[PDB]
Amino acid sequence: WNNIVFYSLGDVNSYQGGNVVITQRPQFITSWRPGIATVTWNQCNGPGFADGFWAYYREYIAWVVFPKKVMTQNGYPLFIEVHNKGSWSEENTGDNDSYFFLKGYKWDERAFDAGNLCQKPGETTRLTEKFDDIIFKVALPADLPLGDYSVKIPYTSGMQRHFASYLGARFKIPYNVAKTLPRENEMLFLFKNIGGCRPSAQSLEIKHGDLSINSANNHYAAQTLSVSCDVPANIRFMLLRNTTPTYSHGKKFSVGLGHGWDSIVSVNGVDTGETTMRWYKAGTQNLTIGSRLYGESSKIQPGVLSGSATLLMILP
Amino acid sequence: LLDRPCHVSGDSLNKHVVFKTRASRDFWYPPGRSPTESFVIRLENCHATAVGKIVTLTFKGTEEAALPGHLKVTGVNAGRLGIALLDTDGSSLLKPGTSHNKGQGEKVTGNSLELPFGAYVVATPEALRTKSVVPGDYEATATFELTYR
Amino acid sequence: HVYIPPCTINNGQNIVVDFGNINPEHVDNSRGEVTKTISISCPYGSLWIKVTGNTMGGGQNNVLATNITHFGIALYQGKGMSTPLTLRSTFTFTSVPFRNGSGILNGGDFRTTASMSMIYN
Amino acid sequence: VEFNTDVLDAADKKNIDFTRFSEAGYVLPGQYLLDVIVNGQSISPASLQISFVEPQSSGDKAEKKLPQACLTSDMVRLMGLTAESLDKVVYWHDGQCADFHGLPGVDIRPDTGAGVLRINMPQARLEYSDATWLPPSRWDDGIPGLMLDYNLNGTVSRNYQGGDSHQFSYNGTVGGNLGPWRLRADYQGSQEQSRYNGEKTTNRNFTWSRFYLFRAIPRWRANLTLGENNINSDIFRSWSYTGASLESDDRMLPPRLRGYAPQITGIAETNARVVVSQQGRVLYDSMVPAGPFSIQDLDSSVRGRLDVEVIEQNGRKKTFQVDTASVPYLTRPGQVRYKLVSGRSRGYGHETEGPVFATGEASWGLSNQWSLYGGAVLAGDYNALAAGAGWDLGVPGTLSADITQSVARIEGERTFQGKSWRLSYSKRFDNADADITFAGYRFSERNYMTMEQYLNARYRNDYSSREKEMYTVTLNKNVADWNTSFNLQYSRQTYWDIRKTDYYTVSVNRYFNVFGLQGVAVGLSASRSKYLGRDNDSAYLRISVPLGTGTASYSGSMSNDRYVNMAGYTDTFNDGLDSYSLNAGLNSGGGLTSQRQINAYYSHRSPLANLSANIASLQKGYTSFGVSASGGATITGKDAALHAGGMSGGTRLLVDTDGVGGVPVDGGQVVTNRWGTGVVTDISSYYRNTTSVDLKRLPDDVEATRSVVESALTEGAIGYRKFS
Amino acid sequence: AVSLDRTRAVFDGSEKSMTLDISNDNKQLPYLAQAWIENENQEKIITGPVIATPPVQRLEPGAKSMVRLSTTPDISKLPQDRESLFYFNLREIPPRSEKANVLQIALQTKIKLFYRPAAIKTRPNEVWQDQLILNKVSGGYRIENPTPYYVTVIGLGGSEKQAEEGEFETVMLSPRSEQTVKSANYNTPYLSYINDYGGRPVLSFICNGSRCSVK
């Protein structure tokens, strides 16, 4: 048999992040505090009490789960990535709403202790265990306004107990019931922003007048955008795909406009889609987004152009 | 067809009748006469009382010094044979260069107008008294001029 | 789309019905209908042709007016006077003068302007 | 037949000996006003007058003369006749008859009654010269002058917090042609002009993207471009270069020989005429001679099959089917296509240099549907020799191969050897219309590389993503009575020892009508990025129903917790002087954030310069009032002009006059300004462009006598057309 | 038959040449349209002010052809304030027969040409006969012309029907001269005249005593 009893931590910590720019990464230490804990999930199908007259073996697996994406007051996601692995054992990187921490350090121990095997949710206990820390880096997104911020990341840090009946029982908790836990822990950290790298336009509209289709070929439609900052970095440009390309033109990242009429998008003369530019000194750079609508395979299709082009700035 | 009034149409374009003449039987006795033939020329889209307003027809040709009023014949009898053209009444001789008399003789057949013309050969009296007419092929040309107002 | 395209009209040439010089008084059952064949270059049909202009009195609806009275120019589609047209590929229309009445006619030489409205889908 | 000589029209002798011609088409001399045609099509309007004098120089015993039209040198210079191959038209004096008996197969029919003089000539040394595409033998070059073409913008940025600032994105592409050589230089990049507040940005931008000099060479049929340019994606990836580049463009050839198609074979015995219709349209109809006939007049924009039937002098016809390839890089057999670039390689900035560059590429078309191509990169430290062939098998599909050995030595002691392969497949029109237009089999090894690794730093942290086997089927099927062209695509990007990513999508564009007019186009798609966890989907829904003066549309998409929609209700109006648009919307940021937004547009294409106004927004309900203007000017030519449509700097004609206030030119409605010069810019390349006058909207002070005229721009040239 | 396109020939002094199409309606035998020029006093003239392009030319049956006329400097040296009269003629000749006593039939249609100079050129809608004066003479009527254009009157009546039906002799009159034609007395004269193209309008007049003016 395998009964699962969960009990989550109850600590609140504060930290001052200081003055930041968007491409630099403010380091943060996730210190562990052996404090109070609260039991939140119980299941009982076996015995309840034990006096310690039978040989009983125990197991321990820790669980600290925080989401990478987090809802803010203004609606934009924080794409936070893991910087270092340490002495860990990484498994299941395919999830996008939760990362998963598990640690096994002690095994093969038989006890002669009397206790409570199936615990009620209303109890608090004493905790004394010291281990290694975690280091945290926060990746700022493409769009962020200035001012002061009070962003709250919800995180459930806990510590459960695994008791079974036979030697060699390696069992794990299923993923669909692990994300249903309540919001216990909070963290009051503050950030100050003077404003870093942000595009001035943020619209990306492509329209013009009208002419016949006999001179529609080798057309031009450009709109530029200015990016400004004050810290030397290595910026990377990536155009996110929203629509579907009609016909194959090879390696060219084409943006579809609908009805079987796509458009070749040339970022500053070179038809590549993704580029690489580094910073040198104070000033600014520009991204001229020109576009050729040459997508006719000898068949005209009259349809109103209402496409879009979503931009995002991935930082290395 | 209503375009180009008093015109010659496509059906009646080439009139050709061959004269059956022999010298000794017609140009040897003084009365110089052979039988006279009739000529038919129809003018489409022309009116009966309005004939003189639109068109007048005159004959063109070279005048003969010994016989006034007829058409030139060439060949072996140049100046010996004459062609007298008859009017619609069949009696008055129309001299070349003189205009046609409007009125009598015309036939209003439908939208067209019928004009009965004549063609006739007359021998020279000096050639009749001296019997100088030689039998053989004779050639002559005729050109009718219509003077439109 | 955003582009309402004009395809072509007789490869950018001027359109003139050369009739020579004929008189406006004729018989209304057979006339000098000079056949004109105008081609239209398509890029790849979805097209209709509408001809407009000023008209005269009566119940007839197939003649455009001129600058002087008692003569007009009538239009019909294709070879043969059976079907008239209500006022890559090709379309044929012939211009011929048609007259239903006699009387006084003041003027013989003419020039006309015909407006062809091309409405696209 | 014989006639009457004795009628005597003139009493005096006119002495032109009127009796011998009773049974050759002798028109006696004078003058005429007919036009000129070659093999059925016209060349110039009926305004030219070529005379004809009688050949008195021909001394014979039969004393017979034939009046041929004594053609003068300037009209033969524009008739389409070549001058380098036949040196017999260059030695006659203008008074004598320029004879035509020396070249074979030419009979002349000089009919002065109908006035057209139809002349046939053989199909081996001709310029066809139809309605468009004038021949290269007659060229009016550009006048010495400068020219610019702008597109301005500008907005206000009102946010809920912090402060306000403005932006002024003013670019510029100047151009100056003095004779044939023209410099296309971009004097402005991007700019910025801000407002004053407590927080300043005040950043002035400057760069220069592309400066190049270019001129087309009509003798060897190429266009050399010296300066900054880009190469196409044939085999290698694209990168900006600097130096000369003898590139064969597609705009310099005629539109009816535009594109690739296989030529037709066959044996004739007499002069037949091939007429062909694919499903109802007649494209070419002309006479072809006997023997092994092979006409190369058109390989136009038609995908596949056509039924070649020939009709000789009695009427019996034979039919046989031909197959087409439709692969994106095949060429015409018997012609050359090449890419000869040289110079130096460019970097990231404008002031960044690199190693010496020299890259040659060409193509060779042999008979019986055979084709060669090949890349030759001869450098001091990089040798990538390419070679390949292309085949048309017919019914199972088409094949192509690419053998390429790239050897190079980097300076950090690294021996580089690498082998890459690529196969291309295609399929013709089936009964259910299924067409695989492109199918790549690009194969890469562990040791293949591109030029991009050495110009950057020594550490690169990425080799390439395109590493192993790929297969890309693109089927497009059309079913009758539904008008639906649904297409599916499947891509394959590869990784090494960690999980592979597979892109594969399905789309469908159906056609139906419920309570409205016909013209409704509605689409649906289903895209999905595959890996073992997180099957990420992508589906967009877009409906477009027109009402003439309005188009109700909602283009909504949903990939992952991001759903939108629109409420557009605008289209164009009756006469065409202005154009507007307006749209609504709502975004979804995943974590319960969903609020409205508004986008609109306000333009009016004025003939002096076209301009627009734009109000836009985003997620947290902002307001961005803008004004945008576009068009250009031609300063310091013979006279100045300002216009409103240009694809690049060039390809437009400027009609000139004197003492006029304003006259609109058809096809773009550009009126002239106060000095009286108008220039139309929304036109095409290498075609016979005609500009006329609008008789229904002119004021009652001016009069136009000469409407129809002709001009000749290749690309980037300015014409010269004065009308009285 | 030699079908002539319109009923008159008009050519401009500022133009160098104009074209006039001819067309034969025969179906089997070919004819030839020969063109030559005579002046006002019926003498043959090959030189002079008008130079003729086609003196002898043939056209096949069911076809059409043309006759163009051009200028010599003698048309420049004559006075340009008034018109002059001369005429171009065209006859068809049929093929000769082999038989004897053959009368060949040749036909021609005579239409007059009027030279309009560039200084006194008229617009196509102009009714230039809106200024003529009418004078009552006893026994007939005197044609007086204050304009430099030609005037040929073949009709004068009390109504339209008597003007087009009534017998009247055709006469031609030179500019700035006069001649008498015999006619009866009428209170309100309606005059018949000929235009440039062949249409048939009628003019209405009002008489004030013995001198009349155009209404």
DSSP string for residues in D202-226: ---------EEEEEEETTTTEEEEE
Q: How many other CB atoms are found less than 10 A from the CB of residue D124?
A: 6
Pair B80, B133: CB distance under 8 Å: yes
Distance, CA of A66 to CA of D526 (rounded, Å):
32
**Whether C89 contacts chain D with CB within 8 A:** yes
How far off is chain E from D112, nearest CA to CA, in Å?
A: 7
How far off is chain E from C104, nearest CA to CA, in Å?
A: 5
- Is 3.40.640.10 the CATH number for B23-148? no
Alpha-carbon separation of residue E44 from C107, D16, E87 (angstroms): 34, 16, 10
Cβ-based contacts of E199 with chain C (< 8 Å): 24-25, 104-108
Cβ-based contacts of B1 with chain C (< 8 Å): 26-27
Give Cβ neighbours of residue D251 (< 8 Å, ≥ 6 apart). Answer: A218, D685, D686, D714, D715
Pair D416, D409: CB distance under 8 Å: yes
Pair D256, C11: CB distance under 8 Å: no
Q: For chain E, which residues make up each domain, given as ranges?
A: 1-121, 122-213
Distance, CA of E85 to CA of C106 (rounded, Å):
24
Strand (E) or helix (H) holding A175: helix A175-178
Contact criterion met (CB < 8 Å) for C12 and D689: yes
User: Which token pair is B32?
Assistant: 């110089």
Distance, CA of A8 to CA of A161 (rounded, Å):
11
- Which D residues in the span 96-125 are in contact with E, Cβ-Cβ below 8 Å? 112-115
Distance, CA of D173 to CA of D184 (rounded, Å):
7
HSE value, Cβ hemisphere, 13 Å, CA-based, for E40: 8
User: Which one of B16, B60, B137, B141 would you mutate to disrupt binding with D, by most D Cβ within 10 Å of its Cβ?
Assistant: B141
Contact criterion met (CB < 8 Å) for A71 and D167: no
Contact criterion met (CB < 8 Å) for C108 and E6: yes
Distance, CA of D589 to CA of A77 (rounded, Å):
8
Contact criterion met (CB < 8 Å) for C25 and B2: yes
Q: How far apart are the first and last CA of chain E?
A: 43
**Amino acid letter, B93:** L
Distance, CA of D454 to CA of A150 (rounded, Å):
45
Distance, CA of D710 to CA of D719 (rounded, Å):
10
HSE value, Cβ hemisphere, 13 Å, CA-based, for E89: 22
Distance, CA of A222 to CA of D610 (rounded, Å):
16
User: Which token pair is A266?
Assistant: 């040339």
Tokens 């550490």 sit on residue: D459
* β partners of residue D678: D655
Chain C CA closest to residue D690: C12
Distance, CA of B111 to CA of B88 (rounded, Å):
20
Separation of CA D463 from chain center: 37
Contact criterion met (CB < 8 Å) for B53 and E1: no
| DSSP letter for each residue of D290-331 | SBS----S---S--S-----EE-SS-------------TT--
Give the length of chain A: 316
- Phi first, then psi: give them for residue D82, nearest 5 degrees: -75, 145
Helical residues (DSSP H) of D152-194, grouped into ranges? none
**Whether B74 contacts chain D with CB within 8 A:** yes
Tokens 């056949």 sit on residue: C35
Contact criterion met (CB < 8 Å) for D114 and E64: yes
Q: Which chains touch A (3 or more CB pairs under 8 A)?
A: C, D
Distance, CA of B87 to CA of C79 (rounded, Å):
48
Give Cβ neighbours of residue A254 (< 8 Å, ≥ 6 apart). Answer: A245, A262, A263, A264, A265, A295
**Amino acid letter, D175:** G
Q: Which chains touch D (3 or more CB pairs under 8 A)?
A: A, B, C, E
**What is the side-by-side strand order in the sheet with B37-44?**
B37-44, B112-123, B81-84
Q: How many interchain CB pairs under 8 A, D with E?
A: 64
Give the length of chain E: 215
Distance, CA of D455 to CA of D463 (rounded, Å):
14
| DSSP letter for each residue of A45-87 | SS-SEE-S-S-EEEEEEEEEE--SS---SS-----------TT
Strand (E) or helix (H) holding D453: helix D452-455
Distance, CA of E10 to CA of E112 (rounded, Å):
9
User: Which one of E28, E101, E161 would you mutate to disrupt binding with B, by most B Cβ within 10 Å of its Cβ?
Assistant: E101
- Which C residues in the span 43-62 are in contact with A, Cβ-Cβ below 8 Å? 43-44
Q: For domain E1-121, give the CATH superfamily.
A: Immunoglobulins (2.60.40.10)
Give the length of chain B: 149
Pair C70, C98: CB distance under 8 Å: no
- Phi first, then psi: give them for residue D151, nearest 5 degrees: -155, 100
HSE value, Cβ hemisphere, 13 Å, CA-based, for C117: 9
Strand (E) or helix (H) holding D337: strand D336-345
User: Which one of D33, D35, D132, D578 would you mutate to disrupt binding with C, by most C Cβ within 10 Å of its Cβ?
Assistant: D132
**Whether D494 contacts chain A with CB within 8 A:** no
Cβ-based contacts of C13 with chain D (< 8 Å): 690, 708
Q: How many interchain CB pairs under 8 A, A with D?
A: 205
Quick check: do E1-121 and E122-213 share a fold?
yes
User: Which one of A207, A210, A213, A257 would you mutate to disrupt binding with C, by most C Cβ within 10 Å of its Cβ?
Assistant: A213
Q: For residue D343, give the nearest of D237, D231, D207, D177 by alpha carbon.
A: D231
User: Which token pair is E4?
Assistant: 């002539």
Q: Is the dihedral of CA D72, D74, D75, D80 positive or negative?
A: positive
- Classified as helix, coil or strand, D173 is strand
Pair D228, D201: CB distance under 8 Å: no
Strand (E) or helix (H) holding E162: helix E160-165
Breaks, C-N > 2.5 A, in chain C lie after: 44, 87
User: Which token pair is D570?
Assistant: 């605008």
Buried b (16+ CB within 10 A) or exposed e, E97-107: eeeebbbbbbb
Q: For residue E207, give the nearest of E135, E125, E108, E122 by alpha carbon.
A: E135
- Which B residues in the span 20-39 are in contact with E, Cβ-Cβ below 8 Å? 21
Distance, CA of E179 to CA of C20 (rounded, Å):
38
Separation of CA D416 from chain center: 41
Contact criterion met (CB < 8 Å) for D205 and A285: yes
Give the dihedral of Cα atoms D694, D697, D702, D703; nearest 10 deg: 40
Q: How far apart are the first and last CA of chain B?
A: 20
Q: For residue E34, give the nearest of E70, E76, E88 by alpha carbon.
A: E88
**What is the side-by-side strand order in the sheet with D282-288?**
D282-288, D272-277, D310-311
| All structural domains of chain C | 1-13+34-101+109-121 (2.60.40.1090)
Cβ-based contacts of E96 with chain D (< 8 Å): 2-4
**Whether C6 contacts chain A with CB within 8 A:** yes
Q: For residue A127, give the nearest of A7, A6, A3, A4 by alpha carbon.
A: A7
Paired sense of beta strands D145-151 and D628-634, if any = antiparallel
Chain C CA closest to residue A207: C2
Q: How many other CB atoms are found less than 10 A from the CB of residue D326?
A: 19
| Annotated resolution, angstroms | 7.6
Distance, CA of A230 to CA of D349 (rounded, Å):
19
| All structural domains of chain A | 2-193 (2.60.40.1370), 198-312 (2.60.40.1090)
How far off is chain D from B143, nearest CA to CA, in Å?
A: 8
Distance, CA of A124 to CA of A111 (rounded, Å):
23
Alpha-carbon separation of residue A146 from A149, A196, E61, E72 (angstroms): 9, 9, 95, 93
Distance, CA of B121 to CA of B81 (rounded, Å):
7
User: Which token pair is D419?
Assistant: 């082998």
Cβ-based contacts of D692 with chain C (< 8 Å): 12, 14
Q: Is the dihedral of CA D286, D290, D295, D301 positive or negative?
A: positive
Q: For chain B, which residues make up each domain, given as ranges?
A: 23-148
**What is the side-by-side strand order in the sheet with A234-240?**
A275-278, A234-240, A310-312
- Phi first, then psi: give them for residue B51, nearest 5 degrees: -60, -50
How far off is chain A from D364, nearest CA to CA, in Å?
A: 23
Contact criterion met (CB < 8 Å) for E63 and D1: no
Tokens 């599909």 sit on residue: D397
- Classified as helix, coil or strand, D405 is strand
Alpha-carbon separation of residue D648 from D231, D643, E55 (angstroms): 18, 13, 60
Distance, CA of A241 to CA of A209 (rounded, Å):
26
- Contact present, A and E (at least 3 Cβ pairs less than 8 Å): no
Burial class (CB in 10 A: 0-12, 13-18, 19+), D140: middle
- Contact present, E and B (at least 3 Cβ pairs less than 8 Å): yes
Pair D241, D357: CB distance under 8 Å: yes
Distance, CA of D558 to CA of D525 (rounded, Å):
11
User: Which token pair is D132?
Assistant: 């468009």
Cβ-based contacts of D708 with chain C (< 8 Å): 12-14
- Phi first, then psi: give them for residue D653, nearest 5 degrees: -105, 145
Distance, CA of C118 to CA of C45 (rounded, Å):
13
- Is 3.50.30.30 the CATH number for E122-213? no
Distance, CA of A305 to CA of D117 (rounded, Å):
51
Contact criterion met (CB < 8 Å) for E36 and D18: no
DSSP letter assigned to residue C15: P
* β partners of residue D508: D524
- Classified as helix, coil or strand, E76 is coil
